[PDB]
Amino acid sequence: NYGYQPLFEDRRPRNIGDTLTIVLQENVSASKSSSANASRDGKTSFGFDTVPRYLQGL
Amino acid sequence: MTPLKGVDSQVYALAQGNILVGGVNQLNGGRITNGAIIERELPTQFGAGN
């Protein structure tokens, strides 16, 4: 003799020892990224090609 | 021949016979007189105690 069993309810596991099907469908995906940058240029110049006489002292 | 189960899914009676439909009236439902025979008995505690 087994216990009371419902009629219209689905067959769910209810006690220790009942079986149940697992459908393994796992799909995980993670990601990350980053960056950084910096820059600097400089260029100076000056040239007195032909100096007049009254400025030759400087 | 049809077995009649309880709520514990055990056979308590066996049913077989001719159906009597009224013949508005219901056509998809009938009743059979003395159509089942008891096969299992239930225990009881009648007669025990005061």
**At a CB cut-off of 8 Å and minimum separation 6, what does B5 contact?**
B11, B12
DSSP B27: S
Rounded Cα distance, B33 and B37, in Å: 11
Q: Please indicate if any CB of chain A lies within 8 Å of the CB of B8.
A: yes
Closest CA to B31 of B20, B22, B23, B17: B20
Question: 3-state class of B31 per DSSP?
Answer: strand
Structure tokens at B23: 């013949």
Closest CA to B31 of B17, B49, B41: B17
This PDB structure is determined at a resolution in Å of 2.8
Question: 3-state class of A10 per DSSP?
Answer: coil
Contact criterion met (CB < 8 Å) for A5 and B8: yes
User: Is the CA virtual torsion A15, A3, B1, B19 positive or negative?
Assistant: negative
Which positions 1-20 of A are in contact with B (Cβ < 8 Å)?
1-5
User: What is the C-alpha R_g of chain A?
Assistant: 44
Structure tokens at B13: 């009676």
**At a CB cut-off of 8 Å and minimum separation 6, what does B16 contact?**
B1, B2, B35, B36
| Determination technique for this entry | cryo-EM
